Design a protein around this nucleic acid. Sequence first.
RNA 1: AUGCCCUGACGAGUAGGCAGGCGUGGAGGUCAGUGACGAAGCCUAGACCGUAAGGUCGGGUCGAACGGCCUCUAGUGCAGAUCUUGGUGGUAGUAGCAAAUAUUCAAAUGAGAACUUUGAAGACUGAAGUGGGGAAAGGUUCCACGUCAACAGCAGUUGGA
RNA 2: UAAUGGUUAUAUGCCGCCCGUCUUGAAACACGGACCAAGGAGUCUAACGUCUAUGCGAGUGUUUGGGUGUAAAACCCAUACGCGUAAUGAAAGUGAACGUAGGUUGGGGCCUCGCAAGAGGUGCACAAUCGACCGAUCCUGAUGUCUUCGGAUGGAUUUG
RNA 3: UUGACCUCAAAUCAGGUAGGAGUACCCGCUGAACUUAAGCAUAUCAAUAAGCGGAGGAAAAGAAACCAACCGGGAUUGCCUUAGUAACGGCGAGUGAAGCGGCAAAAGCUCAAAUUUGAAAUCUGGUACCUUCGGUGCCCGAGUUGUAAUUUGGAGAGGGCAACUUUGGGGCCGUUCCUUGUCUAUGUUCCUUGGAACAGGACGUCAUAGAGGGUGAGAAUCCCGUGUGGCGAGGAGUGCGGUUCUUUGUAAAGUGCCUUCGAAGAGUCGAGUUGUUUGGGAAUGCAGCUCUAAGUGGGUGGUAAAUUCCAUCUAAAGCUAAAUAUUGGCGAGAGACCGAUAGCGAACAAGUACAGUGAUGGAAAGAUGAAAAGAACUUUGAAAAGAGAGUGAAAAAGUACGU
Lengths: 126, 148, 193, 206
Amino acid sequence: AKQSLDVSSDRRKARKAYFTAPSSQRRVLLSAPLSKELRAQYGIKALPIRRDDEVLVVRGSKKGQEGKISSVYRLKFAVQVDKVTKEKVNGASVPINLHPSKLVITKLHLDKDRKALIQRKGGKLE
Amino acid sequence: PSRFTKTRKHRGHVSAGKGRIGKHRKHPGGRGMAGGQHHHRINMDKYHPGYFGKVGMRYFHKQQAHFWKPVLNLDKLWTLIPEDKRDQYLKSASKETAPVIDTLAAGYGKILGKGRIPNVPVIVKARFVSKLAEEKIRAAGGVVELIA
Amino acid sequence: AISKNLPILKNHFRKHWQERVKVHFDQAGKKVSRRNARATRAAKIAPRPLDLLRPVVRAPTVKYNRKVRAGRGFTLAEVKAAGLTAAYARTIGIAVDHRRQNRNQEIFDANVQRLKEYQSKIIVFPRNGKAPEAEQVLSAAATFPIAQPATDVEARAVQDNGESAFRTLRLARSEKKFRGIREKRAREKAEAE
Amino acid sequence: WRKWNVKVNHNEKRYATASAIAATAVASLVLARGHRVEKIPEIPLVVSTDLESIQKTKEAVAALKAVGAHSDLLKVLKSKKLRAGKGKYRNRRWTQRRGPLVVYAEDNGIVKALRNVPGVETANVASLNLLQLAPGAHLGRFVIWTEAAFTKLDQVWGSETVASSKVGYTLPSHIISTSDVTRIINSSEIQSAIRPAGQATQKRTH
RNA sequence: AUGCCCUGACGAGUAGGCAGGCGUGGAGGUCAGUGACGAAGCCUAGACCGUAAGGUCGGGUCGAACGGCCUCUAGUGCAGAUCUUGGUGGUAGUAGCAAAUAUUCAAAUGAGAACUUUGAAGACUGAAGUGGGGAAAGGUUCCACGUCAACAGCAGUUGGA
RNA sequence: UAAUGGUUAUAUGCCGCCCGUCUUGAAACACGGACCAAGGAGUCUAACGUCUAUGCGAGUGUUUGGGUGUAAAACCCAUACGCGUAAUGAAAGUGAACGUAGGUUGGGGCCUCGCAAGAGGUGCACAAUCGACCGAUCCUGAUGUCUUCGGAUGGAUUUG
RNA sequence: UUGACCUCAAAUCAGGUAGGAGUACCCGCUGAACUUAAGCAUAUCAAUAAGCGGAGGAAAAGAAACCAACCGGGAUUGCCUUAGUAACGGCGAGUGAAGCGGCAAAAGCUCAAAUUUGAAAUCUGGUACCUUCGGUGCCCGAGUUGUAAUUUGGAGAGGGCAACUUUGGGGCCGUUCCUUGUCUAUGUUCCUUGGAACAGGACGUCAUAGAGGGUGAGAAUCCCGUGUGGCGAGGAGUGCGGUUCUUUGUAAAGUGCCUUCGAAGAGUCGAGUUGUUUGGGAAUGCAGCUCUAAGUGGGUGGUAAAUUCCAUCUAAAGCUAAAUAUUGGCGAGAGACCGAUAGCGAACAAGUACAGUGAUGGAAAGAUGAAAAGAACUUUGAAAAGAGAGUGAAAAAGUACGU
Ligand SMILES: [Mg+2]
Ligand SMILES: [Mg+2]
Ligand SMILES: [Mg+2]
Ligand SMILES: [Mg+2]
Ligand SMILES: [Mg+2]
Ligand SMILES: [Mg+2]
Ligand SMILES: [Mg+2]
Ligand SMILES: [Mg+2]
Ligand SMILES: [Mg+2]
Ligand SMILES: [Mg+2]
Ligand SMILES: [Mg+2]
Ligand SMILES: [Mg+2]
Ligand SMILES: [Mg+2]
Ligand SMILES: [Mg+2]
Ligand SMILES: [Mg+2]
Ligand SMILES: [Mg+2]
Ligand SMILES: [Mg+2]
Ligand SMILES: [Mg+2]
Ligand SMILES: [Mg+2]
Ligand SMILES: [Mg+2]
Ligand SMILES: [Mg+2]
Ligand SMILES: [Mg+2]
Ligand SMILES: [Mg+2]
Ligand SMILES: [Mg+2]
Ligand SMILES: [Mg+2]
Ligand SMILES: [Mg+2]
Ligand SMILES: [Mg+2]
Ligand SMILES: [Mg+2]
Ligand SMILES: [Mg+2]
Ligand SMILES: [Mg+2]
Ligand SMILES: [Mg+2]
Ligand SMILES: [Mg+2]
Ligand SMILES: [Mg+2]
Ligand SMILES: [Mg+2]
Ligand SMILES: [Mg+2]
Ligand SMILES: [Mg+2]
Ligand SMILES: [Mg+2]
Ligand SMILES: [Mg+2]
Ligand SMILES: [Mg+2]
Ligand SMILES: [Mg+2]
Ligand SMILES: [Mg+2]
Ligand SMILES: [Mg+2]
Ligand SMILES: [Mg+2]
Ligand SMILES: [Mg+2]
Ligand SMILES: [Mg+2]
Ligand SMILES: [Mg+2]
Ligand SMILES: [Mg+2]
Ligand SMILES: [Mg+2]
Ligand SMILES: [Mg+2]
Ligand SMILES: [Mg+2]
Ligand SMILES: [Mg+2]
Ligand SMILES: [Mg+2]
Ligand SMILES: [Mg+2]
Ligand SMILES: [Mg+2]
Ligand SMILES: [Mg+2]
Ligand SMILES: [Mg+2]
Ligand SMILES: [Mg+2]
Ligand SMILES: [Mg+2]
Ligand SMILES: [Mg+2]
Ligand SMILES: [Mg+2]
Ligand SMILES: [Mg+2]
Ligand SMILES: [Mg+2]
Ligand SMILES: [Mg+2]
Ligand SMILES: [Mg+2]
Ligand SMILES: [Mg+2]
Ligand SMILES: [Mg+2]
Ligand SMILES: [Mg+2]
Ligand SMILES: [Mg+2]
Ligand SMILES: [Mg+2]
Ligand SMILES: [Mg+2]
Ligand SMILES: [Mg+2]
Ligand SMILES: [Mg+2]
Ligand SMILES: [Mg+2]
Ligand SMILES: [Mg+2]
Ligand SMILES: [Mg+2]
Ligand SMILES: [Mg+2]
Ligand SMILES: [Mg+2]
Ligand SMILES: [Mg+2]
Ligand SMILES: [Mg+2]
Ligand SMILES: [Mg+2]
Ligand SMILES: [Mg+2]
Ligand SMILES: [Mg+2]
Ligand SMILES: [Mg+2]
Ligand SMILES: [Mg+2]
Ligand SMILES: [Mg+2]
Ligand SMILES: [Mg+2]
Ligand SMILES: [Mg+2]
Ligand SMILES: [Mg+2]
Ligand SMILES: [Mg+2]
Ligand SMILES: [Mg+2]
Ligand SMILES: [Mg+2]
Ligand SMILES: [Mg+2]
Ligand SMILES: [Mg+2]
Ligand SMILES: [Mg+2]
Ligand SMILES: [Mg+2]
Ligand SMILES: [Mg+2]
Ligand SMILES: [Mg+2]
Ligand SMILES: [Mg+2]
Ligand SMILES: [Mg+2]
Ligand SMILES: [Mg+2]
Ligand SMILES: [Mg+2]
Ligand SMILES: [Mg+2]
Ligand SMILES: [Mg+2]
Ligand SMILES: [Mg+2]
Ligand SMILES: [Mg+2]
Ligand SMILES: [Mg+2]
Ligand SMILES: [Mg+2]
Ligand SMILES: [Mg+2]
Ligand SMILES: [Mg+2]
Ligand SMILES: [Mg+2]
Ligand SMILES: [Mg+2]
Ligand SMILES: [Mg+2]
Ligand SMILES: [Mg+2]
Ligand SMILES: [Mg+2]
Ligand SMILES: [Mg+2]
Ligand SMILES: [Mg+2]
Ligand SMILES: [Mg+2]
Ligand SMILES: [Mg+2]
Ligand SMILES: [Mg+2]
Ligand SMILES: [Mg+2]
Ligand SMILES: [Mg+2]
Ligand SMILES: [Mg+2]
Ligand SMILES: [Mg+2]
Ligand SMILES: [Mg+2]
Ligand SMILES: [Mg+2]
Ligand SMILES: [Mg+2]
Ligand SMILES: [Mg+2]
Ligand SMILES: [Mg+2]
Ligand SMILES: [Mg+2]
Ligand SMILES: [Mg+2]
Ligand SMILES: [Mg+2]
Ligand SMILES: [Mg+2]
Ligand SMILES: [Mg+2]
Ligand SMILES: [Mg+2]
Ligand SMILES: [Mg+2]
Ligand SMILES: [Mg+2]
Ligand SMILES: [Mg+2]
Ligand SMILES: [Mg+2]
Ligand SMILES: [Mg+2]
Ligand SMILES: [Mg+2]
Ligand SMILES: [Mg+2]
Ligand SMILES: [Mg+2]
Ligand SMILES: [Mg+2]
Ligand SMILES: [Mg+2]
Ligand SMILES: [Mg+2]
Ligand SMILES: [Mg+2]
Ligand SMILES: [Mg+2]
Ligand SMILES: [Mg+2]
Ligand SMILES: [Mg+2]
Ligand SMILES: [Mg+2]
Ligand SMILES: [Mg+2]
Ligand SMILES: [Mg+2]
Ligand SMILES: [Mg+2]
Ligand SMILES: [Mg+2]
Ligand SMILES: [Mg+2]
Ligand SMILES: [Mg+2]
């Protein structure tokens, strides 16, 4: 239950705040949990998702597939992961949009800001 | 309680209980107290006799606290003594120790003689009393004290 | 129209009264905000007790002159009889009313006693010093209450001299009614010879 | 400027509250109202005052399951339904049943510890909301009392020897001395005074 | 036990009154109710119950919610208002598309030519013109290339489209 | 089991004028209505009468405010104030028990005697009537008066 | 000649200020009619709508020329009540306050005013240096037709004397507060259905977190959040733990007697008349015209006037927070509200398209699917398109798309 008179339980307001979120807010909204191995290694549970992250799909119809995130398509709230495609009938190959909450990060793209982000969230960085 | 109204029962019936002949209109006899002397004269005299005309003398700037004089009757008058003291004051009635009742402190302005205080002497402090209130209070063995 | 045996009503709604309908939906909200203002003001005026000391006065208008109540301020004479000055009393929590006067010794003594009780029960903090805090009590009215003065005992001897005391009201009414016409009768008796 | 709130007489509010408290006694009303209390030994369910100092939700639900509110606590969270109608998108999205009312005399953590548990509502004996005691105007809420709460109830509502601690208040009188008339009717003083009875379905002559 | 049973009489109805019920949106409570193994809606000279308002079921279609009971509440029930908004008929392939004299033959283009282009013939405006320019107004309609779903009340390959 | 029954379509016999509306009178040569869907009309408020229900009851009304709170809820609360407990008169004013709070005539219920029928007693509510009391109106006008004030007592086809 | 003074001007002189917008609420002016009276003219609507002028976050009002008649209260405002009452009114319809009492909030004051007269002790500007919302120096100016100090009726001033009590400011970190960043729990375990699990069943975990929202169907436990706390950052005339200017200084302010005084607002009060307004009645207020005061006297004391008192304030000058209002603006939070013919006119490129010369008027229009996976390719046809094929859980979802 809500205890503060600053946040809203209004469903209409929550949906406007989701669907009209700018990209810097959608980055936090498009978070993805880590794997068992990375959660043991880094001490933290979920991070905002990145391009060069390696992921495993754990839901839907492409579950159990691997790849690198080809694109974080924040305008569609989606991630496009290579090796996860739809073969069209003309021979074209279109990327299937995935949600990061149905993904599991199995290898992070680490740089200085990601390391500081892990340490900020309390992570082991090991 | 909208569902209990007869509007819910007049649904389907054409005139909503108002008639097909007389045929509910806006203001068929006038608005308000219209025509109390012309077409509503019988409803005035028969059920509001005295309505029209003037009665006696005007009072400019009447303050209804020049007229605050609430009336107490002797038939109550022992309610003003609290109940724990009432029993001991009416048992073994006594002059040289009689209850003092401030009537003003209970918020009345005049004592009136409705009837039959018991025969216990009482010291009654009043702004005003009537004659028979005086007679019955003194017949009980008490006294009225005039206060302001 | 006018119809069956009903009381004649006086509902005043022939103006555009719906432009001026105030519904107090904000009763609870304005109560929350008044309590918030009292808490904020208390924190701003730490340890001072959130209201001034008011005198006890007799209410006017013979319907109400049996009661005493809180007045506005103490009377320059009452402040001087309590032993301080008005301009200093206004700084230590006493309301001062320059425009009321004392003509009642009992009300005067009640307010001088009220002021001396207040001066015994306050701790005036030193003006520049350390001033150790003295635990804010939030109301002077609930710690110096207005008491109705006792006017009689519960029991006395019956003292009936037979004046009859309705005759007292009748005679005293008659002297007021005939004071002027018989004063004028007395002076026209004096204007003889 | 429609009338939104309704004034009730204070003594009639107290009447309804007292009758709601009296209905949180014997278990027929509590079973008829809902409230899986068939395996509860005795109603009123009074627990120890140590419940009021429990400040973990896990320990609080262990206490409620241990004193017997397990099946009611499972009736809530298995009755969660999406609300039928246009109310579901007016911030009224889910409906669920009412759990036990845990009534205390002093709060040392029990309110916050039972805050997150579905169905369960807490209450001070100083207040006792009628909306909590007879929800939907159905009498017989399942109520778990603490010992301090149960003791303080005698001071909040009075007795024949304690006044009420509400100004002027007395608990209401009875217009009939018993609520079951069958033993008055089959009492010897009425039965020896009444004429003999008939067939209870009349014979059809003619 | 506003239950059950016995006995008797009675039953027209506009305007109108009162009662007992049926139904709709939303609220509190309950059935730890129904549901993607199919909620709601909708269709059904298929069925069942109710004097009736209505209620229930079967089959089809459908795809995300919705019911019973106890209460609460109202922006709560339609055949009409020359009602409002939207949609659709019959009339009806009908009335009509007849002022301004008038067209015709070939070739080309094209899927397709009464109507486009070019040639040929025939005519008209007849210089107060159906000519050549401007003013107001319009505003790109001018011109070229591509092009015909709509528009040009027939057509169109043409066009101020 | 469609054999009886239900539903439906059809045939046959007899019956059956188009609804709504105003009107004494409508199938009308009176008016609205081609059709279908959706919308579409006694509401809310202030004050109030009757009745009913509930709480308390010579009282009652917590919610203007204050306290409190899990926070527009719920819970608690002082002083006032409104209405009621007194009327009457234009007003100044005055102000409700001769009595078992009266008599008579009815009067449910109850009590006594009665196997009943009844007879007596007590009779609330209520109805009729005659009185008593309070005020107003019209009279009468006692003891006192620092003599014009007071207004006792007794009345009235008057009046509330 | 020259030098002032007064008055009046000029300048693209030095510096500054006003306009217009918005306008829900606020202060004024101005001001109807429909309507009700069963007609209508006074009345009512209404001291309203429209019109015009001026403000602010509130405005206005405000520390009594008050209310009263009491044993007296005591600035203003607002609520409850007074009260649909006193009163007004073709005394018809209608209209209609105020004092008291209970609350919310509370806060008090400033000039004209006196001979500084042994200090024009005062102030704007320019210039120079600084501690730059300002200070200091110097110079010119304003100003005696009066700027400062003292005094405001509650008082107070002058003089005379027993007498004690109180000294003000400036920068730092946390802290009052505002804005804002960041961190902070627990399953995506098994089986069934399904295109998809977020469903159903089983086994768990967290819960000061089971508000809400996303994610391919009802998700506390997948994700964001939520709850509880912690760590910061940038700002606000400071309630306090330290800092320091330390001959800030016979300053300044209070308090006791005695004595002499005690200035207190003019074409204003008041009056008559006219008009308007009011509940205000032989005139409640306002305004025009005319008359025009006084100084133990002026106002008021709700029936006109003379006479005698009494009571109560002290106008004709001025400031001031709160409680109160707020269909506008900014920011939030909610709902027994409406759900695309509803709800704002407008859920959408809506004050848009479009109409009118113009003032103005003013719509219609939401929904494929979880993902475009939006139909490769073959064939018929000039093409549109059809038939197949194919995608999709579904094409009884094919952009002319939920049902
Ligand atoms: Mg990073
Ligand atoms: Mg009912
Ligand atoms: Mg009908
Ligand atoms: Mg009907
Ligand atoms: Mg009928
Ligand atoms: Mg009727
Ligand atoms: Mg009709
Ligand atoms: Mg009629
Ligand atoms: Mg009628
Ligand atoms: Mg006539
Ligand atoms: Mg009259
Ligand atoms: Mg008269
Ligand atoms: Mg008169
Ligand atoms: Mg008398
Ligand atoms: Mg009648
Ligand atoms: Mg509250
Ligand atoms: Mg508020
Ligand atoms: Mg305060
Ligand atoms: Mg006095
Ligand atoms: Mg009550
Ligand atoms: Mg726990
Ligand atoms: Mg559900
Ligand atoms: Mg529900
Ligand atoms: Mg709903
Ligand atoms: Mg719905
Ligand atoms: Mg629904
Ligand atoms: Mg909502
Ligand atoms: Mg919500
Ligand atoms: Mg919701
Ligand atoms: Mg009762
Ligand atoms: Mg019959
Ligand atoms: Mg019948
Ligand atoms: Mg029925
Ligand atoms: Mg509705
Ligand atoms: Mg419903
Ligand atoms: Mg609700
Ligand atoms: Mg399926
Ligand atoms: Mg279905
Ligand atoms: Mg449907
Ligand atoms: Mg059909
Ligand atoms: Mg079927
Ligand atoms: Mg579908
Ligand atoms: Mg769907
Ligand atoms: Mg269902
Ligand atoms: Mg509706
Ligand atoms: Mg309707
Ligand atoms: Mg009908
Ligand atoms: Mg009809
Ligand atoms: Mg129609
Ligand atoms: Mg029509
Ligand atoms: Mg239309
Ligand atoms: Mg059509
Ligand atoms: Mg044709
Ligand atoms: Mg033809
Ligand atoms: Mg023709
Ligand atoms: Mg021709
Ligand atoms: Mg050719
Ligand atoms: Mg041809
Ligand atoms: Mg030719
Ligand atoms: Mg020719
Ligand atoms: Mg061209
Ligand atoms: Mg072409
Ligand atoms: Mg054509
Ligand atoms: Mg064509
Ligand atoms: Mg052509
Ligand atoms: Mg062209
Ligand atoms: Mg057979
Ligand atoms: Mg068969
Ligand atoms: Mg036939
Ligand atoms: Mg036939
Ligand atoms: Mg036939
Ligand atoms: Mg036939
Ligand atoms: Mg025949
Ligand atoms: Mg026939
Ligand atoms: Mg008609
Ligand atoms: Mg006729
Ligand atoms: Mg006829
Ligand atoms: Mg007809
Ligand atoms: Mg005919
Ligand atoms: Mg005709
Ligand atoms: Mg007609
Ligand atoms: Mg028809
Ligand atoms: Mg017609
Ligand atoms: Mg329809
Ligand atoms: Mg409809
Ligand atoms: Mg209508
Ligand atoms: Mg009350
Ligand atoms: Mg309460
Ligand atoms: Mg009188
Ligand atoms: Mg008289
Ligand atoms: Mg008597
Ligand atoms: Mg007598
Ligand atoms: Mg009798
Ligand atoms: Mg009398
Ligand atoms: Mg009387
Ligand atoms: Mg008399
Ligand atoms: Mg310049
Ligand atoms: Mg302006
Ligand atoms: Mg305004
Ligand atoms: Mg104004
Ligand atoms: Mg009007
Ligand atoms: Mg009127
Ligand atoms: Mg008229
Ligand atoms: Mg009329
Ligand atoms: Mg008339
Ligand atoms: Mg007229
Ligand atoms: Mg007016
Ligand atoms: Mg108005
Ligand atoms: Mg205006
Ligand atoms: Mg104007
Ligand atoms: Mg501004
Ligand atoms: Mg303010
Ligand atoms: Mg101001
Ligand atoms: Mg001012
Ligand atoms: Mg003054
Ligand atoms: Mg007074
Ligand atoms: Mg005085
Ligand atoms: Mg005042
Ligand atoms: Mg008010
Ligand atoms: Mg009052
Ligand atoms: Mg009143
Ligand atoms: Mg008026
Ligand atoms: Mg007051
Ligand atoms: Mg003054
Ligand atoms: Mg799965
Ligand atoms: Mg499912
Ligand atoms: Mg199984
Ligand atoms: Mg998903
Ligand atoms: Mg969810
Ligand atoms: Mg959570
Ligand atoms: Mg949650
Ligand atoms: Mg939090
Ligand atoms: Mg001084
Ligand atoms: Mg003055
Ligand atoms: Mg003058
Ligand atoms: Mg003047
Ligand atoms: Mg005017
Ligand atoms: Mg007027
Ligand atoms: Mg006048
Ligand atoms: Mg005048
Ligand atoms: Mg006068
Ligand atoms: Mg709602
Ligand atoms: Mg729709
Ligand atoms: Mg719309
Ligand atoms: Mg529209
Ligand atoms: Mg739009
Ligand atoms: Mg035009
Ligand atoms: Mg135009
Ligand atoms: Mg659609
Ligand atoms: Mg899906
Ligand atoms: Mg096909
Ligand atoms: Mg397939
Ligand atoms: Mg489907
Ligand atoms: Mg298929
Ligand atoms: Mg297909
Ligand atoms: Mg579909």
